Amino acid sequence: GVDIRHNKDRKVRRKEPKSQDIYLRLLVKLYRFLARRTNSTFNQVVLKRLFMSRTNRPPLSLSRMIRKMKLPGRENKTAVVVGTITDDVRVQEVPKLKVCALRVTSRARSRILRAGGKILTFDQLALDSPKGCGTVLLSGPRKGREVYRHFGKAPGTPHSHTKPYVRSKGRKFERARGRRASRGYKN
Amino acid sequence: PSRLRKTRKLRGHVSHGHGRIGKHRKHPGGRGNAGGLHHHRINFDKYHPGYFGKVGMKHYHLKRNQSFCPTVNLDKLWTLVSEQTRVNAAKNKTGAAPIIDVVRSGYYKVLGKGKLPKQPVIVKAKFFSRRAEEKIKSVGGACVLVA
Amino acid sequence: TNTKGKRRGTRYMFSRPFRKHGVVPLATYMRIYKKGDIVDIKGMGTVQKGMPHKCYHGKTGRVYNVTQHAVGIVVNKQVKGKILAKRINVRIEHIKHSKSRDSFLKRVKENDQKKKEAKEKGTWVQLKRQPAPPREAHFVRTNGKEPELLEPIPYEF
Amino acid sequence: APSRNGMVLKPHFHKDWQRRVATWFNQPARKIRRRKARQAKARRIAPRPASGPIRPIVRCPTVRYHTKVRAGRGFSLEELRVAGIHKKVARTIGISVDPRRRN
RNA sequence: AAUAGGGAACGUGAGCUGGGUUUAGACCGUCGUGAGACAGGUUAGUUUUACCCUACUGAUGAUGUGUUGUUGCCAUGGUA
RNA sequence: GCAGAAGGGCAAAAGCUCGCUUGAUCUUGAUUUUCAGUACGAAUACAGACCGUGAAAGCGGGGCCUCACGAUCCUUCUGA
RNA sequence: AACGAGAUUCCCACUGUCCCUACCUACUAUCCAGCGAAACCACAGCCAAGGGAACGGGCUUGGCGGAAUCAGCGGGGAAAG
RNA sequence: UUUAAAUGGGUAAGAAGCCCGGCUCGCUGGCGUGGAGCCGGGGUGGAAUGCGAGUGCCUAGUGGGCCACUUUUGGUAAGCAGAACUGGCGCUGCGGGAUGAACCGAACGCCGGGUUAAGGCGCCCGAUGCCGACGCUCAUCAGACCCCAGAAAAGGUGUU
RNA sequence: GACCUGGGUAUAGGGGCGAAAGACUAAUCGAACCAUCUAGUAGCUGGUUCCCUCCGAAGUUUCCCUCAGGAUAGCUGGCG
RNA sequence: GGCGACGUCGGCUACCCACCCGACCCGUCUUGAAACACGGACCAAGGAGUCUAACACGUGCGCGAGUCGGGGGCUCGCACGAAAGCCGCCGUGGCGCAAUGAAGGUGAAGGCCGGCGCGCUCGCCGGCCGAGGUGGGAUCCCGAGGCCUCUCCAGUCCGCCGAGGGGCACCACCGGCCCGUCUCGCCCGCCGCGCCGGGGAGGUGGAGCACGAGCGCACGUGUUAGGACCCGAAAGAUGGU
Ligand SMILES: O=C(c1ccc(-n2nnc3cccnc32)cc1)N(c1ncccc1Cl)[C@@H]1CCCNC1
Ligand SMILES: [Mg+2]
Ligand SMILES: [Mg+2]
Ligand SMILES: [Mg+2]
Ligand SMILES: [Mg+2]
Ligand SMILES: [Mg+2]
């Protein structure tokens, strides 16, 4: 015997996607080639984001993308996102930025290609910049889901803010004791 | 898929995934929401605070058509018309503002939401908020009310 | 079973020690507690108005809040399998300044300035402290005399 | 019976519901039974129009729907009175009549 | 001569017996509004099976002696 | 001695006598104790009113401290 | 009083209840010819002591241990129901 | 209870730290006072040892426990009832304790060679079949190895 | 002889009938039998079907007409 | 390097037999079972975590501020076709895109610049814009200097680069906005001057906002309701013999 450990020796990350999409399976073969061979840390983040789930690749709208490319320095770079590009209705005009994503939606690649920008995939990204030089790899708001407002301490602990699972919103649905100091108590 | 599930993998093992001691029977805690104040109390607070009691006024026979008003706030307001309108609106002839009526788009009240663009409008809604109509009166627009 | 009362097991520890009873010394109140002052808690027994509990007596926290007659202190409490940053209002008689960082505050003051003495003089003073090393090969001297022969005494009751 | 953070639920299965069960297995069979009841009703009648008489312009009630226009029941004798056709002549002209309707 | 003291599932119910306690009937006393209660008294009340294995008791026999008979010897066990 | 069970505390006092008083009022949160780190109860430090006392600093939002109490549903009264 | 297949105590007569058992008969049992079940059954079936779920057939250390059976037997199998 | 340990409990052992310059405040108020906050600038090697951490969701089983050091409560005591700390058994085989849940070593993939731990080495039964050392002891009930499984007061001109 | 019996007849289930024992009512009676509601309920017993690999417990907290059971926290695994 | 022919050579299994060592009978509840605890004579076949609804989270797919025909409708009379295909002035509707209050109801954009009213603890006009600020922050950008067969002159490249910069998601913090209530307050408005509307500043309550992530389908785990993993009462009711 050697020690008394309560094993965590099997790390619990993803070494491949659980998808059987044969076009993502060739991006994996392309980028895990480029991960272990080009000696860059851009291509290791992009390789591990392709392994991620549909939840861990949240969508990215058009006005977080052009808002994080109005910044100083970003004037000629490419916005790489491992995940889909949607478009805000909120935004009015679009600049001529150059994007690179898995799966741009149809109205998003019409308003990008009206302004004169260019849409890319991860095949012609590697032919353009193998090291990933001059790239702003952007992410989506992964705690933007409806699921995270149900996550927290407990909905009936002090201050809590935790949104109980009620089946329907309204009066006479979880609003009486524990929620006002008259009827019982208040957390 | 009966193939892909836990009971094929758990066949051969005696208590079938439920324990020698606890020995899963039928209904050890009661059926349904039994004992919600008594022995399941700590579950019903800490996860459903508010579950017991009267809280308001009773309204017999409500009709979900009298209270019907959908809302659009001002960012979703220029998508009610074409994009061919607003590009035609601002190209320097006169103060010709387009209509945007939310009632033939299925909305009744116009709420406020920042970044209404620099063009003037005339917006025909049934109701307005005061934040909404003073964004409109600050882009040179007008606020006409309809029944 | 065990009477979960406030001020329960303090027959001795919420008492004035011995022959230090009576009314309190007044420099207890002329102490200056700012935010981030590290203070420790020793609840007295004469003032009843703000004694903390029997769980903080002998512990040490840090001032986050100052009011007219009391001080908010954020302490750590060992509850069963986790420790909890807890914040208690304690009146000013029950605390004092912790001198536990005051022997650190000298050797940041006379360490920063002795660092810049090696920049004007040119050396490698090695200002980090070391533990007690094993003893140096010294040299003892039995000059004149000869060592004393001692032997174990017999047993008598 | 309840557990961690979940939904408090009321399944209405406290009543003997397996006798009163309704399966829609005859539902393709009844879609081709009422197509054949439309086809053998179209060819049976005439060159008279299929799907019956002319319905009026009618506006819906109740604030939520009062901005739309719906097909109605008949033609509200006053409208038959102004147009000049008789109330008992009209339903063999192909015109639906609802006498209880108000203008 | 002496009427010492104890054990073996308080030895021993497919060995017996059933007097006692200890089902159902019943009487009396006390207690209870009552139904009923009482190591309180009394009376009447089904005691099943061995043909199995071992132990034991007897009854043949088995191994070896080439076969079989006769006359014996004593290891061991019991023991008055 | 401090109402009382104990322990802690207390001397131009927290005791004893006297003089005025109602802060034992109105209101929002935070915190501690029990603890799941939920509730009631008890408690602490404030903050905002309106007050009392004192020459004033101050002290006071019940009892020198540790105990002395109670959800939903329903009833009842009060409030704009 | 009379009456109890009622409960009890003593007495006379009477007797195998007993001292204390013995013998005889019939029917079985027993053996043979024919005919033939069931209960029960983890595997099985020699002990002592030890330890052990504190009372073993098996385990531990000892004693030891020859086929196959018959008539009985009621110690045990904490026997069966 | 004046005094008062050993073991123990908290905190601290730097960059979120230190110093300087200025400015906001309706707080505080003899005062360019006090205190908070904000901005900007200057100097990183600050006990020993070991180590990759941080974070969220979903979640089964469990909710009869038992034993031994040491510490202790009730009891005459108990293989008794009830706590504290740690380790075990339960969930765990193996070597030794003849035997065994918990003792002593030691924890386990399937083998070959080497070495050991606890424990042993007359013969069962591997190993003293050493020319082992020094004494003590005779029993007509000798003695013989943690837990552990048998004995006290008293007594002996028995021997040392 | 308040005698014994045949056949006919009447009484039917919370009812019958009883010189009374909770007796009898089709081998069933301190509430028959038959079919159904009904696969009635069970915090309680017994059972719960292939292999290998990897990780690996708990018998404690608080509340409950709670003490053979649950809810809760802890311990666990899987996904990241 | 060497040895051996028609009975020998090699080989092992669900073959048998022997020996030495080890080894109590399984399942089962239990702190503890070889138990003097219970079930099991033997063999064969049957035999126990299902399905529907709801919800939760994880994962896979399609579209994406939207998504979804499930209910209808259309298409010669076609086995397979109870399929598939299409509609879109069939999207009604569902869920999502907005919250809050018992309700009447109300309902989420700020900062700077330049000036002015007692620049009065308050504010006003116009422009510029536009989801604020702090501390961390993968990646990326810049980068003095550094690295090559003779020296001064020039080119691409690559590796090393102290330092500096813009900072993703996310965490902590500060500010802001919307609704309910509280306190303190002054001002403005007119399909009509009121027991009228609107505004302010501070504090608290909310399942909010702060450049959207949802919907549909499928699978897995979990919980529940149903006979609900299988078997099991003593009962209760209705109708009859
Ligand atoms: O016949 C029997 C009889 C005897 C034993 C059983 N048993 N016992 N355990 C048994 C296990 C399985 C089967 N039967 C079993 C059954 C009945 N009688 C009897 N004896 C005593 C009490 C009760 C009765 Cl009824 C009659 C009564 C009249 C006089 N003659 C005897
Ligand atoms: Mg269970
Ligand atoms: Mg399970
Ligand atoms: Mg030890
Ligand atoms: Mg067993
Ligand atoms: Mg009934």
Question: How would you explain this protein's 3D organization?
Answer:
Chain A has about 190 residues and is mainly alpha-helical. Chain A is about 20% helix and about 5% strand. Chain A has five helices and three strands; from the N terminus they run αααββααβ. The longest helix of chain A has 12 residues, at about 25-35. The relative contact order of chain A is 0.12. Chain B has about 150 residues and is α/β, with parallel strands linked by helices. Helix content of chain B is about 15%, strand content about 15%. In chain B, the strands form two sheets. Chain B has a three-stranded parallel beta sheet. A three-stranded parallel beta sheet of chain B has the order 2-4-6, with no helix packed on it. Chain B starts with 5 loop residues before the first helix and ends with a strand. In chain C, strands 4-3-2-1-5 form a five-stranded antiparallel beta sheet, with no helix packed on it. Chain C has helices at about 100-115, 115-120, and strands spanning about 40, 60-65, 70-80, 80-90, 95. The radius of gyration of chain C is 26 Å and the shape is extended. With about 160 residues, chain C is of the alpha+beta class. Chain C starts with about 35 loop residues before the first strand and ends in a 36-residue tail after the last helix. Helices cover about 10% and strands about 20% of the residues of chain C. With about 100 residues, chain D is mainly alpha-helical. Chain D is built from two helices and two strands, in the order H-E-E-H. Chain D has a two-stranded antiparallel ribbon with strand order 1-2. Chains in contact: A-B, A-D, B-D. Chains A and B meet through loops of A and loops of B. The site of one magnesium ion (MG) has 4 residues of chain B, from loops. Chain A binds six RNA strands through helix 2, helix 3 and strand 3.
Task: Give structural attributes.
part of a larger assembly; 4 chains; A: 187 residues; mainly alpha; 3-stranded parallel sheet; 5 helices; B: 147 residues; alpha/beta; binds ligand MVM; binds magnesium ion; ribosome; selective stalling; drug-like molecule
